[PDB]
């Protein structure tokens, strides 16, 4: 490869390569703090949670469920959110605390790998153009065993991290659901389609109070059980 | 049609999460194929195509190998007393003075 002018940390026979990723497919011979070499054509880390395309149409009436049967489209405010229905009209909002915690955890998990490579200045020759004997075969064998072990390690690491991310970003939504259930106490009943049904005359302020955590159930608990029981 | 008028004494607070139409497929330890809203390619499968020597000093053996430069040949006589952190040889190199 011809020589140009730029800034790069690793050099490969193909050329330069950024260090901003933990694995590579370009080549197995590197100089500098280059990432690991694997055999997988592609690898994806779930920098995000599970996707359920929205099915808002239900015959002629429509659907409003969420987190259990229907993921929400058209919400760029944040990851986790809220909706409500009352006499003042349907609406939508986002929870900054939960999405910020999720984003911080995701960013920490991602920064764990990116940029933490190790120096590999001098290594053995990994390409040959001649038959030599037993020592060359041993070098090829150790190269292949190392590559296979690191490929298995990379695949297992990606699978583990994806499983833990998908379960974390779902237990964080089982939380804030149990939390809202505790806040509402006896005033709300879980419909089972994904969210609650509140049995008191809630308004635009009660929804905000529930979102904040200031909600006091003792005020409306006198009429919630009167409506539900 | 549509849902009848919103009830005067009932709320329907609901919780959910975002979703995208172009969901990317990814593999886990339990399910081989699941959909996620966002995913990043961990493996760098593309190269810039050129070698640059900002942090690491790089020497280029345009017409000679490392041994040819070490022994001393005219085609690499500019390599005397040089230093490097990486020496890149060229496939077109060839010994000239002696086999």
């Amino acid at each position, epitope marked *: 490869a011809p020589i140009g002018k730029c800034k790069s940390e690793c050099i490969t026979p193909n050329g330069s390569i950024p260090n901003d990723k933990p694995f590579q497919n370009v080549n197995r011979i590197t100089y500098g703090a280059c990432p690991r070499y694997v055999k997988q054509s592609t690898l994806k880390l779930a920098t995000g949670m599970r996707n359920v*395309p*929205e*099915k*808002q*149409t239900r*015959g*002629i009436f*429509g659907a*409003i469920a969420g987190f259990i049967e229907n993921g929400w*489209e*058209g919400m*760029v405010d944040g990851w986790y959110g809220f*909706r409500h229905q*009352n*006499s*003042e*009209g*349907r*609406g*939508q*909002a986002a929870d900054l605390k939960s999405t910020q915690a999720a984003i911080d955890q995701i960013n920490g998990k991602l920064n764990r790998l990116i940029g933490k490579t190790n120096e590999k200045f001098h290594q053995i020759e990994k390409e040959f153009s001649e038959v030599e004997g037993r020592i060359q075969d041993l070098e090829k064998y150790v190269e292949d065993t190392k590559i296979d072990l690191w490929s298995y390690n990379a695949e297992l690491l990606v699978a583990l991290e994806n499983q833990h991310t998908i379960d974390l970003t779902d237990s964080e939504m089982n939380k804030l659901f149990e939390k809202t259930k505790k806040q509402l106490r006896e005033n709300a009943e879980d419909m089972g389609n994904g969210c609650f049904k509140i049995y008191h005359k809630c308004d635009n302020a009660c929804i905000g109070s529930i979102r904040n955590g200031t909600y006091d159930h003792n005020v409306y608990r006198d009429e919630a059980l009167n409506n539900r029981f | *049609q*549509k849902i009848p*008028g*919103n009830d005067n004494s009932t709320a329907t607070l609901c919780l959910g999460h975002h979703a995208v*139409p172009n969901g990317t497929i990814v593999k886990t330890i339990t399910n081989d194929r699941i959909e996620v809203t966002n995913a990043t390619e961990l493996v760098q499968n593309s190269s810039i195509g050129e070698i640059c020597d900002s942090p690491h000093q790089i020497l280029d053996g345009e017409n000679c190998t490392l041994i040819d430069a070490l022994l001393g040949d005219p085609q690499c006589d500019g390599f005397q007393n040089k230093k490097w952190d990486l020496f890149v040889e060229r496939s077109k190199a060839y010994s000239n003075c002696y086999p």
Partner: antibody, heavy 108, light 107 residues
Framework: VQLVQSGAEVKKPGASVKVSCKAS????????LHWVRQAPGQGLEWMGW????????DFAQKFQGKVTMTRDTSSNTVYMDVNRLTSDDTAVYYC???????????WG | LTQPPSVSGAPGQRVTISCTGS?????????VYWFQQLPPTAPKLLNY???NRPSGVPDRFSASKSGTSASLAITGLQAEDEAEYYC???????????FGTGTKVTV
């Protein structure tokens, strides 16, 4: 999320007019599609809605029988056929992707 | 749904726009929307499900809804105003989404 249309044809009175609305960037069968029209000097006159997941349609109080619409899920598009053209029906036709919580959404 | 046929305001002045209604459409607790438009090109949505904006609209517009009427106020008026406004809501007497009739001249 984008809706494109094809409505540049012109017809004589008493003929039929076909208009096509193509949707992209979102799940086609997930949202109600609306058909509306606008004439100069007048407010927008809403016509009807169609659910792409099925064949269910709904019309206005004066658009019964004279207008129809159909959907093709394999090519994610909808068609509207209007017959019995009259001088008072010369207008520009808009296609809408309705959302039940975010309002009328995107237009065309 | 209707809008006052004429309303005007100099730059830097506030302008108020109101929608009429009855118990069937506004009194039923359904949302109300405004559309800023040019007659030949297209409409553009204002307001939202909540009191937010569709993240493409400047802070110059404020919307509110009451028991029987809704209003849109523009305080920081500029020269970029496309002076045509229509209301929009849902009706229960007839099950069709109903837009409004209106006219505005900046003067």
């Amino acid at each position: 999320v984008q809706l494109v249309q094809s409505g540049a044809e012109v017809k004589k009175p008493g003929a039929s007019v076909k208009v096509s609305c193509k949707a992209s960037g979102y799940t086609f069968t997930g949202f109600y599609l609306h058909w509306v029209r606008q004439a100069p000097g007048q407010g927008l006159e809403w016509m009807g809605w169609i659910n792409p997941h099925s064949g269910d349609t709904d019309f206005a109080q004066k658009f019964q029988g004279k207008v129809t619409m159909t959907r093709d899920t394999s090519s994610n598009t909808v068609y509207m056929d209007v017959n019995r053209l009259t001088s008072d029906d010369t207008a520009v036709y808009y296609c809408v992707k309705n959302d039940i919580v975010l309002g009328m959404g995107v237009w065309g | 749904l209707t809008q006052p046929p004429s309303v005007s305001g100099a730059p830097g002045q506030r302008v108020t726009i109101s929608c009429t209604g009855s118990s069937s459409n506004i009194g039923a607790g359904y949302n109300v929307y405004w559309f800023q438009q040019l007659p030949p090109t297209a409409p553009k949505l204002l307001n939202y499900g909540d009191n937010n904006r569709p993240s493409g609209v400047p802070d110059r517009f404020s919307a509110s809804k009451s028991g029987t009427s809704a209003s849109l106020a523009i305080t920081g008026l500029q020269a970029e105003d496309e002076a045509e406004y229509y209301c929009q809501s849902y009706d229960s007497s007839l099950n069709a989404y109903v837009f409004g009739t209106g006219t505005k001249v900046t003067v």
